[PDB]
Design a protein around this ligand. Structure first.
Ligand SMILES: O=C(O)CC[C@H](NC(=O)c1cccc2ccccc12)C(=O)Nc1ccccc1Oc1ccccc1
Ligand SMILES: O=C(O)CC[C@H](NC(=O)c1cccc2ccccc12)C(=O)Nc1ccccc1Oc1ccccc1
Ligand SMILES: O=C(O)CC[C@H](NC(=O)c1cccc2ccccc12)C(=O)Nc1ccccc1Oc1ccccc1
Ligand SMILES: O=C(O)CC[C@H](NC(=O)c1cccc2ccccc12)C(=O)Nc1ccccc1Oc1ccccc1
Ligand SMILES: O=C(O)CC[C@H](NC(=O)c1cccc2ccccc12)C(=O)Nc1ccccc1Oc1ccccc1
Ligand SMILES: O=C(O)CC[C@H](NC(=O)c1cccc2ccccc12)C(=O)Nc1ccccc1Oc1ccccc1
Ligand SMILES: [Cl-]
Ligand SMILES: [Cl-]
Ligand SMILES: [Cl-]
Ligand SMILES: [Cl-]
Ligand SMILES: [Cl-]
Ligand SMILES: [Cl-]
Lengths: 240, 240, 240
C-alpha cells in the first residue's frame, strides 16, 4: 500500500475533523480507496470517511489493510506538515508511515499502529423528509452561537434552529435562496446534542457547503464533500 | 410596548462588553427619552452610567416606562450571537426582553428572562474638576495596562503624569498638551486610583477614539466615552 | 554613568524576550566597547552569550566599567511596556533606568532594582567545527517545535537530518543544501540534543531571519543569531 496525495492539506483537515470526536478508528485501506468508519465512545454518532483512489495521485494497494490508527497520534504527526506539503502514505503488510515534501525540506514520520478489528456496518442511503444545503460557515456559527444558549438544538423544516436554556432561548430562521437550498417531502422536527454538532463542524475547512438530512426514522446526516475525492458523513441520533 | 431598532448594532455589542467585567446585573431605565442605566460594582467603589438617547436609535417606541432588571452576564452571552454588522432590535412588553439580529436571509430572535432589580437612580449633577484631560482612548488603555504590570495603583497628576510603584520597581508616563491631548487645568491635582477598576473601564475603548478624564480631590474621578450620535458611557471611581 | 540610546528599541524587546525563558538573571558587562552578557541556565547545561557593540547604538556613553546584576524577569516585564517603534534608552548612575520615547507623544520612565550578581566572563575561543549549517531561523524553529511533539531529544547529523523518536513513533527531517540553506561539512557529526533547550534558543528567532548551527563532537553545540549592526546572540548547548 502507498498513496501519494498532492495537496496534503486535505489529509490534515480530515484528521483535524476526526480527532475531537473519536480517538481511534479502523482505517480500511482497499483497492477502491481509503474508507473509514467509527463511532464515538458513547455511540451517539458515527463518522464515515471516504477518500477514493482516483482523487489520489499514484495510489497502489496489494492487500486489504484493517489499520488501527490512533487518531490523536496521527493528528499530532499530521501537524508537522505545512499546508502545501505533498503527503504520501506507505504501509506494508503493523506500523504506518507518512511522508511530507515541498522541494527542499522532506520529512518521514512513522506511526506505530494498533490492533483495532471491528468490522464495518453496511450503511445504505435512507430517505429523508427534509434536506438542507447551506454554507458550512453559516452552519458552524449557528451551532456555536446556540450552544451558548442551551445544550440541545431543535431543527425544523417549513428551516429553523432553536435552543432553550437557563438565560432564555433563541432561534435562527433560514430561508431558501453561497446558496441555501431546502428539499422537503414532509415537515420534520428533531432535537440534537450541540456537543456533537460542534464536533462535526470541525470539518468546515474541507468544504464551503454542508448538507443536513433529517428524518424521524433515521439519524441526522451532516455531510461535507471532500471535493474530487470523497466526503465526511456524520450521523447523529436524536435526544429523547 | 418598548421597541428600539439600532442599525449600528455593534454599539450594543460593545456596550455589553464594556459592562460585563464590572457589573453582573443592572436596572435598565427605559423611557421615551431613551435608555438610561446606572449600576455600581459589587464592592461599591465604582459607578457606571450609560446613556443612549432615543433620537440616536433608528426607531424608538416606549408606550409605558420600564425598569428592566437585566442579568448582564446573560445579555452579554446573547449579544455575542450577533454579527458586527447585524441590525439589532430590542423589544419588550408590559417580564422578559427580546433581541433581534438581522444579518440578509438569516434572522435570529433571542429571548432573555428579566429579574427583579429595581433601584431608583440617583441624580448625578455636573461637578467642577481641578483638572480635565482629553486623550486618545487607546493610549489611555495602553498606559493603564502597562502600569498594572508594575503595581496595583496609579497616581495621576497635572501640571499630566501617570505613576505606578511596586515590588518590581517604579514607572511613570508623561503626556504633554497638544488624536490630540488636552488639559484644562484650573488647579494642580494629584490622586491615586485602583488600576483594577480603570482596566475594567477601558473595556469601553472600542466605543470611541477619545476618552475624557475629570479629576478633583473632592469628587470621584470620571472616565467618559462618548457613544457617537447617541450618548455616553461614564465611569466614576473613588480614589485612595 | 552609563547611557545607551537605541532608536530601534525593539531590538531590546526581542533580546530580552529571547533570554527570559532560559535565564532569570545575568550579569551584564558594560564597558566602552559595549554590552556583553554571559549567563548559564540553572542546570548548567547551556550558556547564552550576548554582544551589543557601542557603535551599534545611536549614542553610547560609558564613564566607568559596570557589572550590572539584572533580574531578567523584571527587565522583560518592563520592556513589554515599550512599543515596538519606541526609542529605548538604558541608563545607570543601585538601579537601572529604562526610557521609552514614542515622535515623543508619550514618554515613559521605568526604574528597576539591581542585584548582587557578578561572575567573571570566560574566554570562549573560536573553536573549529565539523559541520556548520546556516538556514532560515523560522524553519529551524519549526523543525524543533515539530519534533518536540514526537520526542524529547533531536538527533542532528550531517545533506543534514534532524531525528526524533518517541512513544508515538519516529520522525526524520532532511534539508538539502539549496533564504538559503548552506551546509559546510568537514566530517560527518551526529550529536543528540535536548529539544527543551533548543526551543528556548528559538525564542530569539525574531532577531535574525537566519540562524547558524555549528557542531563538533568535542564542543557544545553553537546556535547563533546575528543582531544586524550590533552583534549576536550565541546559545551554547551540551549534547547527551
Ligand atoms: O444595579 C445594581 O447593580 C444592583 C443594585 C446595586 N446596589 C449596590 O451596589 C449597593 C447595595 C447595598 C448598599 C450599597 C451602598 C452603597 C453603594 C451601593 C450599595 C447598585 O448598583 N445600586 C445603585 C445603582 C445606581 C446608583 C446607586 C446605587 O446604589 C445606591 C443607592 C442609594 C444610595 C447610594 C447608593
Ligand atoms: O466603603 C463602602 O462600601 C462605601 C463606598 C462609597 N460610599 C457610597 O457609595 C455611599 C455610601 C452611603 C451613602 C451614599 C449616598 C450617595 C452616594 C454614595 C453613598 C463609594 O465609594 N461610592 C462611590 C464610588 C464611586 C462613584 C460613586 C460613588 O457613590 C455614588 C454612587 C451613586 C451616585 C452618586 C455617588
Ligand atoms: O466634605 C464635604 O462635604 C465635601 C467633600 C466630600 N467628598 C468626598 O467624600 C469624596 C472625595 C473624593 C472622592 C470621592 C469618591 C466617592 C465618594 C466621595 C468622595 C463630600 O462629602 N462629598 C459629597 C458631599 C455630598 C454629596 C456627595 C458627595 O460626594 C460625591 C459627589 C459626587 C459623586 C459621588 C460622591
Ligand atoms: O548569571 C547567572 O545567571 C548566575 C551565575 C551563573 N552561575 C552558574 O550557573 C553556576 C553556579 C554555580 C556552579 C556552577 C558550575 C558549573 C556551571 C555553572 C555554575 C552563571 O551564569 N555563571 C557563568 C556565567 C558565564 C560564564 C561562566 C559561568 O559559570 C562558570 C564560572 C566559572 C567556571 C565555570 C562556569
Ligand atoms: O553540572 C554538570 O554536570 C554540567 C555542567 C557543565 N560543566 C561546566 O560548566 C564546568 C564544570 C567544571 C569546570 C568548568 C570549567 C570551565 C567551564 C565549564 C566548567 C556544562 O555542561 N557546561 C556547559 C554547557 C554548555 C555550554 C557551555 C558549558 O560550559 C562552559 C561554560 C562557560 C564557558 C565555557 C564553557
Ligand atoms: O573528547 C575528548 O576526550 C576531548 C574533548 C573534550 N570535550 C568536552 O569535554 C565536551 C564535549 C562536548 C560538549 C561539552 C560541553 C560542555 C563542556 C565540555 C564538553 C574536552 O576536554 N574539552 C575541553 C577541554 C578543556 C576545556 C574545555 C573543554 O570543553 C569545552 C570546550 C569549549 C567550550 C565549552 C567546553
Ligand atoms: Cl474512541
Ligand atoms: Cl461522494
Ligand atoms: Cl454586580
Ligand atoms: Cl451626551
Ligand atoms: Cl537563572
Ligand atoms: Cl559579530
Amino acid at each position: 500500500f502507498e498513496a501519494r496525495l498532492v495537496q496534503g492539506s486535505i489529509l490534515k483537515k480530515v484528521l483535524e475533523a476526526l480527532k475531537d470526536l473519536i480517538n481511534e478508528a479502523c482505517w480500511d485501506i482497499s483497492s477502491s480507496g481509503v474508507n473509514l468508519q467509527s463511532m464515538d465512545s458513547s455511540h451517539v454518532s458515527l463518522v464515515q470517511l471516504t477518500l477514493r483512489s482516483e482523487g489520489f495521485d499514484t495510489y497502489r494497494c496489494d492487500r486489504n489493510l484493517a489499520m488501527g490508527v490512533n487518531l490523536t497520534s496521527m493528528s499530532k504527526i499530521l501537524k508537522c506538515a505545512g499546508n502545501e506539503d505533498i503527503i504520501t502514505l506507505r504501509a506494508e503488510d503493523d506500523t504506518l508511515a507518512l511522508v511530507f515534501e515541498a522541494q527542499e525540506k522532506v520529512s518521514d514520520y512513522e506511526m506505530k499502529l494498533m490492533d483495532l478489528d471491528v468490522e464495518q456496518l453496511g450503511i445504505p442511503e435512507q430517505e429523508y423528509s427534509c434536506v438542507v444545503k447551506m454554507p458550512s460557515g453559516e452552519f458552524a456559527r449557528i451551532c456555536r452561537d446556540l450552544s451558548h444558549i442551551g445544550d440541545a438544538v431543535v431543527i425544523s423544516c417549513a428551516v429553523k434552529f432553536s435552543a432553550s436554556g437557563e438565560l432564555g432561548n433563541g432561534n435562527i430562521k433560514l430561508s431558501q435562496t453561497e446558496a441555501v437550498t431546502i428539499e422537503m417531502n414532509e415537515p420534520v422536527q428533531l432535537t440534537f446534542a450541540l456537543r456533537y454538532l460542534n464536533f462535526f463542524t470541525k470539518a468546515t475547512p474541507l468544504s464551503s457547503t454542508v448538507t443536513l438530512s433529517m428524518s424521524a426514522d433515521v439519524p441526522l446526516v451532516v455531510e461535507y464533500k471532500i471535493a474530487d475525492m470523497g466526503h465526511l458523513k456524520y450521523y447523529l441520533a436524536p435526544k429523547i
